[PDB]
Amino acid sequence: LKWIPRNLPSCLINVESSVTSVKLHPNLPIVFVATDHGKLYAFDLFNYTIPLASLQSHTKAITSMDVLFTNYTNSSKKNYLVIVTASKDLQIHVFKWVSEECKFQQIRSLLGHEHIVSAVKIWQKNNDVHIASCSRDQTVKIWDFHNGWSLKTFQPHSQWVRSIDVLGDYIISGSHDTTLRLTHWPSGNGLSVGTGHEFPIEKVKFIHFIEDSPEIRFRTPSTDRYKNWGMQYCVSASRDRTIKIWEIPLPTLMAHRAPIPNPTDSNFRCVLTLKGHLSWVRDISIRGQYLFSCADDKSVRCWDLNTGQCLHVWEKLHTGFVNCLDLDVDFDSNVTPRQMMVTGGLDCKSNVFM
């Protein structure tokens, strides 16, 4: 099942003001947009122009949205029923999604960060038992979903934490100190600090059903079959204008417990650096065969990490900066219906690409 990532936009959805995050629903043909309004809107992406629902209750600006992504089929079916959001009012609001495609109620407001919350995520591995968030604080926080309690607070970076992406046991953070960290969620220890970005990191995504990506670069250079299948990976997007690929078992950061422990506390292990287009990279996604990305260069770009080439550019996508994109996850019977990407800009629009 190969795919099409292109055309001229076959839906353009008017939005109030600046789009901050765009996010697909797991099960239903509906997609959700967050903005500086401070509001969440809902659209059917199959049909247009569709004014399905609006959500109000944040004070200042909504900067991230999650609860849609899931780590399993059964978790999917139960998970798409909540929505979590992030804001510049220092709130993490928890919403209730209804079968009629809207949110009829806010369930919780969670308080505990002292500045701008700029990302939020549900822990899909735990069946929506916990929420992660990050902030201008310099802080990452973990919250009980069903009590609203703050349960773990990581203290890591010396500057603004911009993003948090979770993979069950592990936590990927990204920040203004030019650094990506991977922290172990149960202990609070950091396995990795990925150092070598030149400017602020805005973004992270983990790699999925495509650990066939080693074909391009083999790590360690020797005796691969011992530990090559155990490699976990992520991507960072930055104000560098560059996108990096990291495998994480070998850019583990040392704290120096002896001295230098092999290439640990050396240069980063970073697999590929994709050098492309013309402004700050706001987003980054794994398709499988390809990587997708968006940036302040008014553009959404398709990257072939086979040969490092950028195989297509959709630069007229927005007339201002592009803040976020989302791809639709392939699944049996839904193959062709999951043919979309959604994208949101500073030109106050959410756009559907087939």
Curated annotation (Swiss-Prot):
Keyword Repeat: yes
GO cellular component: cytoplasm; microtubule; microtubule associated complex; spindle pole
Alphabetized UniProt keyword annotations: Cell cycle, Cell division, Coiled coil, Cytoplasm, Cytoskeleton, Microtubule, Mitosis, Repeat, Transport, WD repeat
Keyword Cell division set for record: yes
Molecular function (Gene Ontology), one example: dynein complex binding
Positions annotated as WD repeat: 14-53, 57-105, 112-153, 156-195, 208-256, 276-315, 318-353
Example GO biological process: cell division
Compartments, as annotated in UniProt: Cytoplasm, Cytoskeleton; Cytoplasm, Cytoskeleton, Spindle pole
Domain notes: Dimerization mediated by the LisH domain may be required to activate dynein.
Record's subunit section: Self-associates. Interacts with NDL1 and dynein.
Task performed by this protein: Positively regulates the activity of the minus-end directed microtubule motor protein dynein. Plays a central role in positioning the mitotic spindle at the bud neck during cell division. Targets cytoplasmic dynein to microtubule plus ends, thereby promoting dynein-mediated microtubule sliding along the bud cortex and consequently the movement of the mitotic spindle to the bud neck.
Similarity remark: Belongs to the WD repeat LIS1/nudF family.
Full protein name: Nuclear distribution protein PAC1
Gene it is expressed from: PAC1
Part of the full-length chain shown: 140 to 493 of 494
